[PDB]
Amino acid sequence: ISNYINTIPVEEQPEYPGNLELERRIRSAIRWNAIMTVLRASKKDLELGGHMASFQSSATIYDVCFNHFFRARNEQDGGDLVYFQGHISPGVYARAFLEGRLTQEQLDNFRQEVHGNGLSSYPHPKLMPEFWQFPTVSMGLGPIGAIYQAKFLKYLEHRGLKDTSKQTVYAFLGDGEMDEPESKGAITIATREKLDNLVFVINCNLQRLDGPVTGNGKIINELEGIFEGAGWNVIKVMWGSRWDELLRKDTSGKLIQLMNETVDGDYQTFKSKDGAYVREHFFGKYPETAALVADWTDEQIWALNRGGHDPKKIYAAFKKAQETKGKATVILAHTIKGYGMGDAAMDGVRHIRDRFNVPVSDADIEKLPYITFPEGSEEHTYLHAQRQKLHGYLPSRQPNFTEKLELPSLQDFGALLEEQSKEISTTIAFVRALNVMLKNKSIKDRLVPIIADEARTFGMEGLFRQIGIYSPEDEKGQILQEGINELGAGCSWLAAATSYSTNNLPMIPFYIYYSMFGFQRIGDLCWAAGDQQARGFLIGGTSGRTTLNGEGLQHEDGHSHIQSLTIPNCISYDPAYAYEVAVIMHDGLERMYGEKQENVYYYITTLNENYHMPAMPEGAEEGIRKGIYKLETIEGSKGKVQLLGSGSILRHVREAAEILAKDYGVGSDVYSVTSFTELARDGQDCERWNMLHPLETPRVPYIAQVMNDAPAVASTDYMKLFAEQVRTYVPADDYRVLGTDGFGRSDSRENLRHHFEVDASYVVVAALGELAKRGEIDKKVVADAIAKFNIDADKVNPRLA
Amino acid sequence: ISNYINTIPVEEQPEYPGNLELERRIRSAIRWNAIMTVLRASKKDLELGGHMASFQSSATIYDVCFNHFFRARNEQDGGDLVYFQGHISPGVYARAFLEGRLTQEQLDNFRQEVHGNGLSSYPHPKLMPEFWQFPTVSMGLGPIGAIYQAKFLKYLEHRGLKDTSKQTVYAFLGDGEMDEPESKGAITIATREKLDNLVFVINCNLQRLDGPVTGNGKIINELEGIFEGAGWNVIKVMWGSRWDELLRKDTSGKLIQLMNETVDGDYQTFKSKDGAYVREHFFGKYPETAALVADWTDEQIWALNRGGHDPKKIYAAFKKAQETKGKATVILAHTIKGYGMGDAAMDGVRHIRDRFNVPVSDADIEKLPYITFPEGSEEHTYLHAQRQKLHGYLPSRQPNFTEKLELPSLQDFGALLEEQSKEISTTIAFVRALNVMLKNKSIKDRLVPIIADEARTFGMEGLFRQIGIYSPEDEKGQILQEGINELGAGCSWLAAATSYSTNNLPMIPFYIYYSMFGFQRIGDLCWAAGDQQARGFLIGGTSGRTTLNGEGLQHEDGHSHIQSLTIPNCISYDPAYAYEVAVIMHDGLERMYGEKQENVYYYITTLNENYHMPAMPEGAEEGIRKGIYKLETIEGSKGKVQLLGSGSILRHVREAAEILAKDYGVGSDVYSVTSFTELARDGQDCERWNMLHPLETPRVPYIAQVMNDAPAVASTDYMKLFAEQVRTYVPADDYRVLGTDGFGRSDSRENLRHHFEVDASYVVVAALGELAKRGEIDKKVVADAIAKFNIDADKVNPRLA
Numbered sequence A, B: 001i002s003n004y005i006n007t008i009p010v011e012e013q014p015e016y017p018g019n020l021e022l023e024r025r026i027r028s029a030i031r032w033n034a035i036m037t038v039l040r041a042s043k044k045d046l047e048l049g050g051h052m053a054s055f056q057s058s059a060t061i062y063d064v065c066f067n068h069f070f071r072a073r074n075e076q077d078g079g080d081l082v083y084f085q086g087h088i089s090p091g092v093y094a095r096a097f098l099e100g101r102l103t104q105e106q107l108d109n110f111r112q113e114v115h116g117n118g119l120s121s122y123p124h125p126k127l128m129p130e131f132w133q134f135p136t137v138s139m140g141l142g143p144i145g146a147i148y149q150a151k152f153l154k155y156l157e158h159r160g161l162k163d164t165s166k167q168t169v170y171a172f173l174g175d176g177e178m179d180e181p182e183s184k185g186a187i188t189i190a191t192r193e194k195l196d197n198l199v200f201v202i203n204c205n206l207q208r209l210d211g212p213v214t215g216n217g218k219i220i221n222e223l224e225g226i227f228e229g230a231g232w233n234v235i236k237v238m239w240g241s242r243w244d245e246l247l248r249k250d251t252s253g254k255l256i257q258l259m260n261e262t263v264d265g266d267y268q269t270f271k272s273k274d275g276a277y278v279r280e281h282f283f284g285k286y287p288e289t290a291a292l293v294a295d296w297t298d299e300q301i302w303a304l305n306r307g308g309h310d311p312k313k314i315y316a317a318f319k320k321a322q323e324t325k326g327k328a329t330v331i332l333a334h335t336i337k338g339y340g341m342g343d344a345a346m347d348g349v350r351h352i353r354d355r356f357n358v359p360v361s362d363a364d365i366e367k368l369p370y371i372t373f374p375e376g377s378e379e380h381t382y383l384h385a386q387r388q389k390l391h392g393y394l395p396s397r398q399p400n401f402t403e404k405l406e407l408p409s410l411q412d413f414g415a416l417l418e419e420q421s422k423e424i425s426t427t428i429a430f431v432r433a434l435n436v437m438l439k440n441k442s443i444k445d446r447l448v449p450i451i452a453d454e455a456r457t458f459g460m461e462g463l464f465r466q467i468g469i470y471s472p473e474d475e476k477g478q479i480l481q482e483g484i485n486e487l488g489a490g491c492s493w494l495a496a497a498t499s500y501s502t503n504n505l506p507m508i509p510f511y512i513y514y515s516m517f518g519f520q521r522i523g524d525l526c527w528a529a530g531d532q533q534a535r536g537f538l539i540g541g542t543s544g545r546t547t548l549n550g551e552g553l554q555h556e557d558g559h560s561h562i563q564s565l566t567i568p569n570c571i572s573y574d575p576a577y578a579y580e581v582a583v584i585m586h587d588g589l590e591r592m593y594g595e596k597q598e599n600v601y602y603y604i605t606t607l608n609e610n611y612h613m614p615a616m617p618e619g620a621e622e623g624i625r626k627g628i629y630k631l632e633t634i635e636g637s638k639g640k641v642q643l644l645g646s647g648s649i650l651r652h653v654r655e656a657a658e659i660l661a662k663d664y665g666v667g668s669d670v671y672s673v674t675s676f677t678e679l680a681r682d683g684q685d686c687e688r689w690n691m692l693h694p695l696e697t698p699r700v701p702y703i704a705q706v707m708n709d710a711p712a713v714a715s716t717d718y719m720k721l722f723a724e725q726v727r728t729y730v731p732a733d734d735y736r737v738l739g740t741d742g743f744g745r746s747d748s749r750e751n752l753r754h755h756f757e758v759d760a761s762y763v764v765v766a767a768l769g770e771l772a773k774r775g776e777i778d779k780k781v782v783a784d785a786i787a788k789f790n791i792d793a794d795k796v797n798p799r800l801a
Ligand SMILES: Cc1ncc(C[n+]2csc(CCOP(=O)(O)OP(=O)(O)O)c2C)c(N)n1
Pocket: A054, A087, A137, A138, A139, A140, A173, A174, A175, A176, A177, A178, A203, A205, A207, A208, A209, A337, B453, B454, B484, B486, B514, B517
């Protein structure tokens, strides 16, 4: 930790290149319109919300960036990637409005978006696909997402895919937000990777929402201490220009001492007092410091400002950041929260108009008018000139990539469609499918395989020899090895999955990890990825409750699909078979990166269990994509049922079908369900359409088109709700679902499948139970099956075990 | 960063208090039994799994701790709280066996739990309630959990609730695991809170699973740099005692330079070679370093070891940490991964028996026999003597607390059971309920209100004046204000929620935060809390997709209940009314902290929307607890439907009920569903039991004892699955569910409820639709209703919007 003063002394401060007074006129209009936007929303009394205090404290920081640093998307690269702090969005809207990119009508619909001509509260690409780029409102996610975006830009350069050298990634953070573990938890990575294209800009107004970040301490010193410790270049923007004469005049060093010893809480109290209270409780702490302002009027003292409000000090910091190589830079900008808002942070509005010399007359003020700069005006000319020199306007977003990729055909995955000689797993199928893609000339170098330390567990090690590990194992390595860091891997996957938009360079990430540590562990990033329109694959390896058998409670995933079905634009599959994996991956590839350019990402759970992989039935492709297809029909004269299974448990349903027929003369239709979720969604879509078109012929869910009315039983390696979600659409009156509800534990697969009551013996007993409720067989036969299979009818419910 | 040598020079090292030769014998027997345990499991060929290399690298560190530092649970306090590294559990089991706490049959059932008297793969209290305490295998979670556990212990002391001053929290971490953002993301908190009762022990073997943490860097220096910068006391245990002579006679300072400049990758290469290789490639880098070992044999050079394997260096580090105050200490223990296994770091294990001089012939070795120390042997006596001096054995766990609390009765919440005077929200109801608890002499000081920065948003500010904010706003403050850090807040909640077991001191936490940032953001910790048998309350505030209307996409929660239903021992509720909040909170209190001592925690979503709160219907209490009860029946002669709602949408369902009756002559039963999830679980339980007992009187799902067979419609502020989950158990053939599937966006509550198709209008159309399909009313009536209500039947499905 250094003294509590600017890192860049005035003697090393470059001349400011802009027109300060003109820039302030423009900035005042931006401040005014931002406030107007929020107040007009408030007018409506619809509890719309919206903030003002934060943008007021960071406005000047952003203003210097828009006038002298931020590069917009251009023909060479995507421009600077700015992770705008979420709640200062009203300031971004105000500026875009002044630049003529948004209309008054849109500002007037700030926070009312359902009817189409509105503005989102925060940066949501999914809601404003041509405007926002990075969802930052969910705090903590901005900072780590930025780190990995910066890393991904270096990767694209190193791999010879795109020259991103002129791009800077800016993460605009709040100081309270730095308490999120995700905010500082990955900062050493920027040093390991020498991310000199990354700048963290922390607005140190010393406050969170409901109080100071650390009133009894010095949050700026805390941040400096740990970032410096992590190898970052730290630039503190502490004081404005008026302090420069005062500091060089302090030959005693007591002013510095005074500044260093004062704590956050006290600096914040001074901010509320007055110029007299200041010379008294601050400058008046020591005679030498009190003597420095002895010849100062109380008004001249109150004029002393924080560095984050002085364009000259701000500019020096971003310039130094821009010049720095070898490591990332973090700028700690000292500001006043609710700057110039006196009242809280009609008289209040008048105070603001006056404080910032806003060009709004007394006759118009009550109309809360927006201010505009006419073409020909000095303000209009300068606003646009500065931006034209930096390549246009931002933020802006391109929702589709321009190039046409020549994707592999399903035929290209032919070997995976045939019966397998060796027993393999769906994870081995996934790796083989990836190898098929790495043979495609068009996309082979666009693929981005990602792992979180573990590769061998997923049989990814063979790929290493072929494409190597990215390690600026060299700078040309293709695989991203992110270590024991699922959030980080997820952020790399997200940067890759959105490169198609950000850099007009489609990249296709496959991130494979232990499924339990996916949505459960990085779920907020997964939701953010949907907002960001990510197009990529999440492969949840070692999936299924009973299948990663020895690992136990915190590893056995019988519910990731329940978490994944909550994401609207995540498409989820739980395939059993080698060929389904191939069809599913080919289709996802086509949908996301073919002409359709569908904005969805995929989640495929894969397995670590080897078994016989049969050939794909002729014509089953569409059913596989839609979610279900009839695999086999077994003959039986005594009764008929339908049996459904997915992932590793389909095996055992299929065994149950043999037993039902051989031992009980009960025929069955047997379905592989590659996606209960896609089927449930299709069902809801049909039910919804039907309800809204009462005069039309009811539409039929795909699952109801595949199935008949015979009593049905489903079993999967996931909790019962996974299969129960399609109940409403299943055309049979009786539908019984078995599942792995309950905490996992270590044992053999056989023991866990019996414990969770999903194995063949339970499927059989479940099927006979339905046939008994129909009278087709005597209840006694079900009782006898239970004893026959050594099923303990009285063991505790697995959910409670 | 300091030089790459021990922090503690030999000169300041205390004399080792133990019997080194006897300790080594005992330690070798533990290493052996640990290996035997895993190899026997392997032989079964059931893919059980299990690690050996990591415990070998950390065995000596744990050994010094077990013999000289770890305090077991005792009469005065819970002893030291040791977060053992997940996957060195075989070593803990081996020591426990040697201590006579586990039988051979248990070791022989390592990773086969299902039949009882087995052992979990990792620390899972839910599975071994009297043994393990803290679930750590989900790497990342142990370090942050440990930080907040240490802070919680300080809180307990500061609040005068329990003298925890003699307890130390030890977090045993891997160096690769430190990459998880959660591992270092909160390390600054330990400094803010002066956690001198916290010791992080990082096993620096330089390796994660598939390779080095940073082969081209120095992971120990990275860790030292950031922890030092975060204000921690860092103690490096780099080199064993054989190096002391070398460092002492090297007046050139070259050995140190050489140690400093060598990177992790090269150090790992040395360990894979031999003495000659080290002499040439390490010491041979400089004439002076070559000179230091010129008269050493290659064997003597090869004997040089890493500090983490020398009991004397280990002891000095732990003793120093024990005397360090004002901040937490992190010990960076340098070790060799695959220690003593060398060749592969039945007989290929005789290398291990010879390496550690294990008393087993080259003929019994194939039988993988366990070593024990008979009562009376020098080893047995010493093993137990050292532990007795430390109060017994650990880990161990007490499942229930001993004291009896005198809990508030439901009548104590009587004011909340009456009609409220003004329109309030369920969040206001929650705060009023907490206030009733704060008046109970028995539990008032055991309550732990927890917030993540925002308090005003949840109306928690009034409490600040009453019970204060914990700030060691002073150290007697009761509310934990964790800032913008949901994971940290969750970790404080977890420490509080398990204090009943850990410290035999029941504390009752209530963590309120924005519901979107609950399971979605800290879901892996919520799963771990379940494993840890947490008993507390998670209050998801500002919940419901349409209800936190202006906030938009990353805030509007219409799915946390889908995430929460995945945790077996989380009981979830979405009440509509203040009296339901009261009944649920009272019941939860009695279940978890009353004589039942049920191992479940609660999740209650609450709202930020005010509306009329009617009085509780007489006798509705149990129905509120169970999940559903009938509110009223409205007459109508043209048809009959059932209408269900929960949370903020119930009042709109009631509006629909009035519209149906008054405009269409359609009567209704109206139900408030307080918990769709508990009803679904009850139904699954009933059906499971019935089908396993085909001849017995079947169990009737609770929901089926409340609802009848008239067509039903449900609507809630959550995606359709939340209400669909009970379909199988609803006793009506038509059950239509409305929900908030799709990404949220900013608008008025009215606009969002119409966009998400969940408002009164849609419920009416849904109900009329069912009647028309029964030919009870003309299909035209539905079409006209759609028109009358300005419903756009062709707008896109909200799930895709
Ligand atoms: C994960 C998450 N938790 C909580 C919030 C709610 N929130 C909105 S503004 C705010 C305070 C932000 O303080 P700080 O980061 O210091 O920024 P400032 O407004 O001072 O610039 C919080 C906690 C959020 N957006 N995301």
